[PDB]
């Protein structure tokens, strides 16, 4: 089997991407944030504290003839951005782009943090990291991909995120028309539960490539590119007037600037992030100070190849017995 679904930016900045997901019988379609940095499929629901729902579409398990309470199971998750959610668990039928999993754990939120409430466009998350990170207790549950894997034509999914435009998540096949050149594959460590890999270096604009190993995670659920402070300083030094602002929470730059590109290495291959992908717009409405899309990972504890990086590539998440990651230009 295979599946193919379009993923759509939630706003004009590509702050996140939503993908429609069918849950239950009859189907209830929710728009979920596919997150290769976590491993829980959780949704706003009829159980979510009413004051914490503000415009989201909810899953109502009592209206699904295939929903079953997973007795005694609870979940609770905290994300790197400080947000969180928790609740109980159903199993139900879940379909993405024509690919169906029966008995998928659907984590129903009883509580969500303010950031989730305040974002009316995201109805929940669909985790695509390794199932070892799943938070369900006392019996850990499998991700949608893990459940689908054996049925897929090939044990892979691909992320093809757009810049200020829709893109595609495919399951079970590689669309050879979706990228240019070849796909370069690189080793993955699953030791921390992430799609963790090592970039071979970087360049800023038309500058020379610096060969240096940068361990980080391919994370579709993180907006920005978070890299070591040395790398980030080298980038922003090429933008007149750019500075790190403790008050704002990162590097800012004059909105009148033209940003240089940023290249990262995948083995001997190179992925170029155009400068415009690095612009996250005014820090507040009407400001002429703009927020940068490349930020320091110092104090995160890990480097994160988030959407800024991934949307410059066609990315293969290869879930073979020994997982790997592939990157192609597009």
């Amino acid at each position: 089997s295979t599946g193919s679904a379009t993923t759509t930016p939630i706003d004009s900045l590509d702050d996140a991407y939503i993908t429609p997901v069918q849950i239950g019988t009859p189907a209830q379609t929710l728009n979920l944030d596919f997150d290769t940095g976590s491993s829980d499929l959780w949704v706003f629901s009829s159980e979510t504290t009413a004051s914490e729902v503000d415009g989201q579409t909810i899953y109502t398990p009592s209206k699904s003839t295939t929903a079953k309470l997973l007795s005694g199971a609870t979940w609770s998750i905290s994300y790197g951005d400080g947000s969180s959610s928790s609740g109980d668990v159903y199993t139900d039928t879940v379909s993405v782009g024509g690919l169906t999993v029966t008995g998928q754990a659907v984590e129903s939120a009883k509580k969500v943090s303010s950031s989730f409430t305040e974002d009316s466009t995201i109805d929940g998350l669909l985790g695509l990291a390794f199932s070892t990170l799943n938070t369900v207790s006392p019996t850990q549950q499998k991700t949608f991909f893990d459940n689908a894997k054996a049925s897929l034509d090939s044990p892979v999914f691909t992320a093809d995120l757009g810049y200020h435009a829709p893109g595609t998540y495919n399951f079970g096949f590689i669309d050879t028309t979706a990228y240019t050149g070849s796909i370069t594959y690189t080793a993955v460590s699953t030791k921390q539960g992430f799609w963790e890999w090592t970039s071979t270096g970087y360049a800023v604009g038309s500058g020379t490539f610096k060969s240096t190993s940068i361990d980080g995670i391919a994370d579709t659920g993180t907006t920005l590119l978070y890299l070591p402070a040395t790398v980030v300083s080298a980038y922003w030094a090429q933008v007149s007037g750019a500075k790190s602002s403790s008050s704002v929470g990162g590097y800012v730059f004059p909105c009148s600037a033209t940003l240089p590109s940023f290249t990262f290495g995948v083995g001997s291959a190179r992925i170029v992030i155009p400068g415009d992908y690095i612009d996250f717009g005014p820090i507040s409405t009407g400001s002429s100070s703009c927020f940068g899309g490349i930020q320091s990972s110092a104090g995160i504890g890990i480097n994160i190849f988030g959407d800024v990086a991934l949307k410059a590539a066609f990315v293969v998440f290869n879930g073979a017995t020994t997982p790997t990651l592939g990157f192609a230009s597009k």
Side-chain angles (χ1 to χ4, degrees), residues 1-62 64-67 69-109 112-141 143-148 150-190 192-242 244-330:
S1 61
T2 64
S4 180
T6 299
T7 192
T8 301
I10 64 165
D11 63 22
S12 66
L13 299 174
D14 298 346
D15 282 317
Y17 297 79
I18 50 172
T19 309
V21 178
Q22 282 71 50
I23 309 175
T25 310
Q28 300 179 39
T29 299
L30 275 65
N31 296 328
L32 305 188
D33 184 351
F34 282 24
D35 180 13
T36 62
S38 68
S39 306
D40 287 50
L41 192 175
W42 75 260
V43 297
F44 278 79
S45 75
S46 56
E47 301 177 329
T48 311
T49 300
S51 63
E52 295 180 352
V53 184
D54 189 3
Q56 296 80 10
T57 295
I58 63 167
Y59 170 57
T60 302
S62 68
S64 175
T65 56
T66 41
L69 180 71
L70 186 62
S71 180
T74 59
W75 63 279
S76 180
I77 192 163
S78 305
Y79 296 101
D81 70 348
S83 68
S84 64
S85 52
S86 61
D88 54 18
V89 187
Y90 293 80
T91 56
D92 209 341
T93 302
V94 173
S95 299
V96 177
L99 170 65
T100 300
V101 169
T102 59
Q104 174 64 46
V106 177
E107 303 173 32
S108 167
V112 303
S113 64
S114 60
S115 178
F116 288 115
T117 299
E118 290 161 2
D119 183 4
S120 68
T121 70
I122 290 175
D123 302 323
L125 267 65
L126 189 150
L128 292 167
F130 294 87
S131 293
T132 54
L133 295 181
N134 176 266
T135 77
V136 177
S137 178
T139 306
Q140 188 172 65
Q141 301 293 304
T143 71
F144 176 81
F145 178 55
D146 203 345
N147 283 321
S151 301
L152 295 177
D153 290 357
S154 179
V156 306
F157 68 92
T158 64
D160 180 9
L161 302 179
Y163 167 66
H164 293 178
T168 306
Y169 281 102
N170 290 330
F171 292 82
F173 72 105
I174 287 161
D175 178 359
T176 61
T177 73
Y179 57 86
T180 62
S182 300
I183 305 176
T184 295
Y185 290 86
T186 196
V188 165
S189 173
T190 65
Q192 295 191 78
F194 301 123
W195 292 92
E196 186 171 3
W197 64 290
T198 302
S199 173
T200 49
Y202 70 97
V204 176
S206 59
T208 63
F209 186 83
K210 176 71 170 183
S211 291
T212 183
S213 295
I214 304 169
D215 297 336
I217 65 168
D219 187 358
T220 58
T222 290
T223 313
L224 306 186
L225 174 54
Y226 294 89
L227 293 172
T230 47
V231 178
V232 175
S233 181
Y235 178 80
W236 290 109
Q238 298 304 310
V239 180
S240 297
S244 184
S245 169
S246 57
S247 59
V248 174
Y251 281 89
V252 297
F253 68 93
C255 295
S256 61
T258 299
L259 297 178
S261 64
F262 184 89
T263 300
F264 63 94
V266 182
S268 59
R270 306 288 179 254
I271 300 294
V272 180
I273 305 171
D276 297 335
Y277 290 26
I278 298 160
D279 176 18
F280 281 75
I283 60 171
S284 292
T285 303
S287 180
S288 70
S289 184
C290 275
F291 197 68
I294 295 178
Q295 297 293 346
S296 179
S297 64
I300 292 177
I302 198 159
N303 300 305
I304 307 174
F305 294 88
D307 298 334
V308 164
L310 302 182
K311 75 180 154 205
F314 177 88
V315 188
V316 181
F317 294 80
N318 171 26
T321 303
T322 300
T324 65
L325 273 170
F327 292 81
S329 294
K330 65 187 184 191

